[PDB]
Amino acid sequence: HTVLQIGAGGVGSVVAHKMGMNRDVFKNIILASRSLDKCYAIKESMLKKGLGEIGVEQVDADDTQALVALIQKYKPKVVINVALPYQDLTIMQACLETKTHYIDTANYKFEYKEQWAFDRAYKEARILGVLGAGFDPGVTNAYVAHAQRHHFDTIHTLDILDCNAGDHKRPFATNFNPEINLREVSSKGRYYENGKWIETKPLEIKQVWAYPQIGEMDSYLLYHEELESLVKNIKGLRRARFFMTFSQNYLTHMKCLENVGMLGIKEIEHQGVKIVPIQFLKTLLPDPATLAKDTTGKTNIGCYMTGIKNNQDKTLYIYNVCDHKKCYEEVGSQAISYTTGVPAMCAAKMICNDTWSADHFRAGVFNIEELNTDPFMEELIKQGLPYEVIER
Amino acid sequence: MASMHTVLQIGAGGVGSVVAHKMGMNRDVFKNIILASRSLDKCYAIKESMLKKGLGEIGVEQVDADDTQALVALIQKYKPKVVINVALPYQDLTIMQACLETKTHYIDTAEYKEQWAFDRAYKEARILGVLGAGFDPGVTNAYVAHAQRHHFDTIHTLDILDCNAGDHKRPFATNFNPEINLREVSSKGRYYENGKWIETKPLEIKQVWAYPQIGEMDSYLLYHEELESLVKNIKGLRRARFFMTFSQNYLTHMKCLENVGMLGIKEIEHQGVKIVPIQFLKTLLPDPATLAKDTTGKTNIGCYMTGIKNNQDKTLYIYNVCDHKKCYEEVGSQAISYTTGVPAMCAAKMICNDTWSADHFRAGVFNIEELNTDPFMEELIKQGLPYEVIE
């Protein structure tokens, strides 16, 4: 089979690389992006690693008509959106117009409104739209769905816990555009409890949590995309929360940068030239491609649920641990891009071998917890993202 | 008896405003006060401020202090008795040259090699060259000289302790150009002990010291200009060290700023435009003139000496405390610019009423500890910087 991937960033290189590891399913792989240089670089690494050749194209993902012509040129079975989060709606519309299947990952106050509003159109066109096929959201959605059907009768509470304990060996550096980092630590927290959404102050709710294979880490309450999906799609939920770890090193740096004005979004005039501080910060901080080679450590993402099984109390903790350096030696990217990009390729496999389909019974726009997670989880294990359970 | 005189001041910054204001408080000495700078805006701001405070009128002139002939023409126009250099620190060598060419007396506030090389020329011209008439150097040099002749026969140890305990009410802000700040915390430390100069790691030697009217503050060992002159001019010195306070808040910011590359001095390309990181930091941070109105707190600068007076161990602590808000209410600047500029005006007064003179072999280029500090100290008390002695 043949698939079209739009995006050649850190997460996009994992999808292309891992796709090249499964050449029994993905016969022809085509990559398109605004930056042609990044595409050929991904082509080279895969060629250097003996995974075959990839097709390379340039495309403006803000232009639906250019995307439609691109899709019609290669006639792919599914299009993977690993590009910018503002181009998700023009890529979704192109998939609709061209009657091709759609997957997105890494979409970064977010709402599912406009992506979900394509359901009726996607249904009437007999195609599938899988939203958030990353890790959080994505595999975490599968973890909750996998526990609804194999480990619980009723789920009362859910806590999603994201921990990155990697060391890039630099004093300070980000793996994403600094605006991501700014968003994480400056936005109000939001969680769901007893039919209401509760908003908090930025990093107002702290807690220490024991992450398997890592240790105890300071975990702060944040809002995440997946909460919206899960709260709406899992009935009977009494509490839903998302937690991410932040070290005191990192938090102090961010508060100092905020105090000098280096986290600014509005531009300011310097030497007759308008500059955006956070954008200057991106130029200063090391290029994330060079951080991958040196980064060491582990990540832990998973869900901790309390529910009821056979009218007896149960608590479940499904989680995955990923080793930054192990990812770099396998594909050449770090664990944040690996945990986000491997599910995307697994979702693509599930559509190309017809496990996940829009044919017959149902079609439309779905989150991963609405689909058959059994073959997805088995595929995640085979491709390098095995999970661990802690049941009590 | 004393004659009224004309003074030419080159510089209209924080220190330059204090010097101009303080000269306008002493109209028995300074009949004409002329201010010159590249920025007429800053000069006119000082002019208005003084008029609002009933301190008189001043003369304002535009000049590029890198142009010796432009400086010479200004001196010849006004024929001032002394020229006070509170301008940019690389322009002192051109201002000294103009003073030489016009046979006029020179004062500045901030190695001494190239500045000391004017000694022969200045002697031949029968003019005076007073270097470092700020607080440190300046009053601290005076403190050591004043203790050398009134409190000690031999001075064994000298520790200069500079403390700024003011709160500018901002999360983070600097009182000068960020390159100063970078030098302060990134340069190796240097001190003198038993005839040798010792180099240290940046902020390697810390110590807690209780500064009168402030409290205990973390003091770090640094190098300072004055050590050069003082070690050479104070006979019998066994140790000479300079200490400055740094809060953990400030230090934490500097360590973070240095880690992202925001303390960089080499240019980097950003969006096809070559940028100097630290210069961008100066644009971001509050303009230091806007901090004076909000600053509260105190400063403590002084010298701590242990020596010998008629074969008995003695220790002395001469120091000055200054209130930021009290300074702003008087002249409109904060205490860091107040402690630096008031000595400069006093040094100008010592030259205009002839306490400090070039007549009768008294000429050449000097540091404050090489001069008659007794009327200098009396003037510092009168002008707003009284000191405290503790034995």
Side-chain angles (χ1 to χ4, degrees), chain A residues 1-17 19-26 30-33 35-37 39-43 45-47 50-52 55-64 66-74 76-83 85-108 110-123 125-168 170-175 177-187 189-195 197-200 202-234 236-237 239-254 256-265 267-273 275-277 279-284 286-292 294-297 299-311 313-325 327-332 334-348 350-358 360 363-377 379-381 383-387 389-390 392, chain B residues 1-37 39-41 43-47 49-51 53-78 80-102 104-110 112 115-123 125-152 154-187 189-195 197-200 202-205 207-215 217-224 226-234 236-237 239-265 267-268 270-273 275-281 283-292 294-308 310-311 313-325 327-390:
Chain A
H1 256 310
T2 293
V3 297
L4 177 56
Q5 169 182 328
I6 317 233
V11 174
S13 161
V14 170
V15 176
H17 274 78
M19 217 151 47
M21 288 168 179
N22 302 266
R23 290 294 200 161
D24 45 73
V25 180
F26 310 101
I30 298 126
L31 246 189
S33 178
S35 165
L36 208 305
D37 287 320
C39 293
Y40 277 155
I42 296 182
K43 179 185 196 153
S45 179
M46 285 173 71
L47 215 317
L51 297 185
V56 175
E57 292 263 355
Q58 190 267 337
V59 74
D60 186 26
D62 284 324
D63 187 357
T64 308
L67 282 166
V68 169
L70 185 56
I71 292 165
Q72 283 173 344
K73 172 170 176 181
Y74 292 100
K77 174 149 201 189
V78 62
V79 172
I80 309 178
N81 167 18
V82 294
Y86 63 91
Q87 316 174 319
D88 53 1
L89 291 191
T90 59
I91 296 168
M92 278 187 96
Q93 178 78 37
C95 284
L96 179 67
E97 283 185 8
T98 197
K99 277 169 189 204
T100 314
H101 293 288
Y102 171 84
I103 289 171
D104 73 21
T105 187
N107 253 51
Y108 310 119
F110 176 92
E111 290 242 32
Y112 274 120
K113 211 133 191 175
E114 294 71 19
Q115 295 203 261
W116 283 345
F118 276 113
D119 195 37
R120 177 183 44 242
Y122 268 55
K123 256 151 174 65
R126 212 92 73 184
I127 56 178
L128 209 52
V130 188
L131 304 194
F135 206 107
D136 42 342
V139 181
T140 56
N141 302 65
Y143 285 171
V144 177
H146 173 89
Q148 244 301 176
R149 71 140 31 173
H150 286 334
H151 291 274
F152 287 102
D153 283 281
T154 287
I155 294 176
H156 287 272
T157 69
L158 159 72
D159 282 2
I160 302 117
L161 313 148
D162 181 346
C163 176
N164 179 20
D167 178 49
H168 46 51
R170 321 272 162 145
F172 180 89
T174 66
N175 336 273
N177 184 340
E179 336 213 4
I180 296 289
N181 300 78
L182 173 64
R183 225 223 6 248
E184 277 171 357
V185 313
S186 66
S187 322
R190 207 179 191 241
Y191 68 103
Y192 178 74
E193 212 189 43
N194 294 308
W197 288 95
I198 315 293
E199 224 144 49
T200 75
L203 309 179
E204 185 189 348
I205 296 173
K206 181 183 181 176
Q207 96 166 334
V208 177
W209 182 265
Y211 294 80
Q213 313 195 23
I214 289 174
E216 290 171 307
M217 300 283 212
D218 307 271
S219 293
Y220 299 76
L221 188 144
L222 300 181
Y223 179 75
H224 233 250
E225 303 81 82
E226 5 181 23
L227 289 202
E228 225 209 346
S229 138
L230 290 185
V231 166
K232 147 206 167 170
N233 282 327
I234 300 308
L237 260 192
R239 202 179 61 184
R241 299 187 315 191
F242 179 84
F243 287 90
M244 187 172 211
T245 63
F246 291 129
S247 73
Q248 270 294 348
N249 196 36
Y250 176 93
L251 278 179
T252 312
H253 278 103
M254 298 288 308
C256 289
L257 290 177
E258 181 213 310
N259 286 158
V260 299
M262 266 316 268
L263 289 194
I265 51 160
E267 77 246 75
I268 49 71
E269 135 107 356
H270 166 67
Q271 283 188 5
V273 183
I275 311 175
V276 185
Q279 292 175 29
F280 192 47
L281 178 62
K282 174 188 171 172
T283 300
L284 275 178
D287 185 0
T290 60
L291 294 184
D294 310 322
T295 308
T296 65
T299 64
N300 194 300
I301 311 174
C303 317
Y304 170 78
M305 307 155 269
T306 76
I308 254 148
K309 174 62 151 186
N310 298 323
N311 202 344
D313 290 3
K314 189 181 182 51
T315 75
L316 192 60
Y317 190 157
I318 309 185
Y319 66 78
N320 166 259
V321 178
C322 208
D323 199 337
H324 284 285
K325 182 116 304 200
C327 302
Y328 173 76
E329 304 190 89
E330 173 181 8
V331 307
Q334 36 90 319
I336 296 312
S337 297
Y338 194 97
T339 50
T340 306
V342 163
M345 171 247 100
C346 290
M350 226 93 322
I351 279 175
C352 295
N353 70 10
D354 283 70
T355 301
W356 281 347
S357 266
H360 319 312
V365 166
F366 301 112
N367 287 106
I368 292 272
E369 72 271 6
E370 303 180 88
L371 305 186
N372 179 28
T373 64
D374 261 22
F376 186 54
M377 295 270 206
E379 201 58 38
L380 285 171
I381 294 164
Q383 294 300 345
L385 289 183
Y387 57 107
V389 181
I390 285 190
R392 295 190 151 188
Chain B
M1 195 190 268
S3 206
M4 305 192 153
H5 288 307
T6 290
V7 173
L8 178 54
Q9 167 181 326
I10 316 292
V15 172
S17 158
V18 170
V19 178
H21 276 79
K22 276 301 179 176
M23 279 178 308
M25 288 163 178
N26 301 266
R27 292 293 195 160
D28 46 300
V29 182
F30 311 110
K31 56 171 178 171
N32 288 130
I33 297 144
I34 293 82
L35 245 187
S37 178
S39 164
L40 283 195
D41 291 322
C43 293
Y44 281 123
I46 298 180
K47 174 186 192 116
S49 180
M50 285 174 71
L51 269 171
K53 306 173 166 71
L55 300 185
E57 307 172 350
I58 63 167
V60 171
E61 291 259 351
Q62 185 159 48
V63 74
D64 185 25
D66 291 325
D67 187 359
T68 307
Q69 344 167 37
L71 282 166
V72 167
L74 195 58
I75 292 165
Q76 286 173 345
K77 170 172 176 184
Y78 289 104
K81 174 147 201 190
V82 59
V83 172
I84 308 176
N85 167 19
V86 288
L88 296 167
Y90 66 113
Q91 313 175 314
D92 56 3
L93 258 263
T94 58
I95 297 167
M96 278 185 95
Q97 177 76 35
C99 287
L100 178 66
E101 287 183 6
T102 67
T104 313
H105 299 296
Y106 171 87
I107 291 170
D108 72 20
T109 62
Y112 276 116
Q115 294 202 256
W116 278 345
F118 277 82
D119 195 60
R120 212 272 288 162
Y122 266 53
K123 259 147 176 160
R126 292 177 305 284
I127 57 177
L128 206 51
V130 184
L131 306 193
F135 206 102
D136 42 346
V139 187
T140 54
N141 300 27
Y143 286 174
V144 177
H146 171 90
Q148 167 76 111
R149 74 183 234 176
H150 289 47
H151 293 274
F152 288 98
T154 286
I155 291 182
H156 289 301
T157 68
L158 158 71
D159 282 4
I160 305 195
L161 311 156
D162 183 349
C163 175
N164 181 20
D167 183 17
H168 48 53
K169 304 320 200 221
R170 318 272 160 142
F172 180 76
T174 64
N175 300 275
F176 356 82
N177 182 340
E179 332 193 12
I180 305 290
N181 303 261
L182 170 61
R183 161 163 101 254
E184 276 171 355
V185 310
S186 66
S187 322
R190 204 183 190 221
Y191 69 109
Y192 180 75
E193 213 187 43
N194 295 308
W197 286 95
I198 312 296
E199 265 183 353
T200 75
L203 312 181
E204 186 186 350
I205 293 93
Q207 91 162 330
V208 176
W209 181 266
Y211 295 79
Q213 315 196 25
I214 289 173
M217 301 279 142
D218 300 45
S219 294
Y220 301 76
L221 189 144
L222 298 179
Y223 173 70
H224 223 190
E226 5 173 19
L227 289 206
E228 224 218 298
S229 82
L230 286 188
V231 163
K232 149 192 172 170
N233 283 327
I234 298 308
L237 257 191
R239 202 176 60 183
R241 295 184 311 189
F242 177 83
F243 289 97
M244 185 172 240
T245 62
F246 288 128
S247 74
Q248 271 293 347
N249 196 31
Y250 174 94
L251 280 176
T252 310
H253 279 104
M254 299 289 308
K255 228 320 168 264
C256 293
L257 288 172
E258 178 191 308
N259 285 158
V260 300
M262 270 318 266
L263 290 196
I265 47 86
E267 298 192 302
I268 58 155
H270 166 67
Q271 287 188 5
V273 183
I275 313 238
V276 185
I278 191 92
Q279 292 175 16
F280 186 42
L281 180 63
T283 300
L284 276 176
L285 300 177
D287 186 359
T290 62
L291 296 183
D294 308 318
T295 306
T296 64
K298 296 193 192 256
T299 62
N300 193 297
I301 311 173
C303 315
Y304 170 96
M305 307 155 269
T306 77
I308 270 324
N310 293 323
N311 295 255
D313 294 343
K314 144 118 90 191
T315 74
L316 191 58
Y317 188 43
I318 310 183
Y319 70 81
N320 165 261
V321 138
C322 211
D323 192 337
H324 283 284
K325 180 85 16 186
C327 299
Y328 182 78
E329 303 190 307
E330 178 180 13
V331 305
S333 325
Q334 29 76 9
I336 291 312
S337 295
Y338 192 96
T339 48
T340 308
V342 160
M345 167 255 135
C346 291
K349 175 160 176 164
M350 304 294 95
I351 278 179
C352 296
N353 71 13
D354 278 282
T355 301
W356 292 350
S357 165
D359 290 347
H360 317 327
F361 295 76
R362 295 250 103 113
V365 165
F366 299 111
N367 281 108
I368 294 270
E369 72 272 6
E370 303 177 72
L371 304 184
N372 177 29
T373 64
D374 267 301
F376 189 58
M377 296 271 192
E378 309 198 275
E379 204 60 39
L380 285 172
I381 295 162
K382 261 218 292 170
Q383 295 301 344
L385 291 191
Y387 53 103
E388 227 78 8
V389 185
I390 284 190

